[PDB]
Amino acid sequence: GQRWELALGRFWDYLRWVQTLSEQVQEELLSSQVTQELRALMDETMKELKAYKSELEEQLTRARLSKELQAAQARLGADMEDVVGRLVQYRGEVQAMLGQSTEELRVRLASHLRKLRKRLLRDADDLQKRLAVYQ
């Protein structure tokens, strides 16, 4: 129930919706709305994570653990940036189609998103584990 976990949960719920590639998702993927909204949720998650670590350091080998926690935090942020970037890519590939069917592009986006989401989830679990043993 930590603040950064709730923020990550909002990013995660939003991305679970994007995965469906429903009509309204597809509409908002060709505007900047999905990637703008996900970036805001990403930034919030990272901000709350930074503040949580800072407060944990008040209730605490340490050097190694602190560097490993930094690396796990950076992985989470890179994962979220990779998701946003893949969705920016999709918008460009649609435009290149010049009005032609995007069904194949959507099948391919859906399968790639599943794998990016798998990576984000496993990195979030690893980060949560390191935060629990840091404290």
104 binds Na ion (CB under 5 A): yes
Regarding 105 and contact with Na ion (CB under 5 A), the answer is yes
The three-state (H, E, C) secondary structure of the chain, written as one string: CCHHHHHHHHHHHHHHHHHHCCHHHHHHHHCCHHHHHHHHHHHHHHHHHHHHHHHHCCCCCHHHHHHHHHHHHHHHHHHHHHHHHHHHHHHHHHHHCCCCCCHHHHHHHHHHHHHHHHHHHHHHHHHHHHHHHHC
The interface region with Na ion, picked from 17-25, 34-42, 63-71, 102-110 by CB under 5 A, is 102-110
Q: Is 26 in the site for Na ion (CB under 5 A)?
A: no
Q: How far is it, in rounded angstroms, from Cα 21 to Cα 32?
A: 15
Q: Considering the complex, what minimum distance in angstroms separates the CB of residue 15 from Na ion?
A: 9
Annotated binding residue at 119?
yes
Size of the site for Na ion (CB under 5 A): 8
At its nearest, how many Å lie between Na ion and the CB of residue 55?
Answer: 27
Stretch in the footprint of Na ion (CB under 5 A) among 12-20, 54-62, 75-83, 117-125: 12-20
Residue 117 annotated as binding site = yes
Does 82 engage in binding with Na ion (CB under 5 A)? no
User: For the purposes of burial, counting CB atoms within 10 Å of the CB of 35, is it exposed (0-12), middle (13-18) or buried (19 or more)?
Assistant: buried
Beta carbon nearer to Na ion, 104 or 125:
104
Name the residues that contact Na ion, by CB under 5 A. Answer: 13, 16, 89-90, 93, 102, 104-105
Binding residues for heparin: 116-119
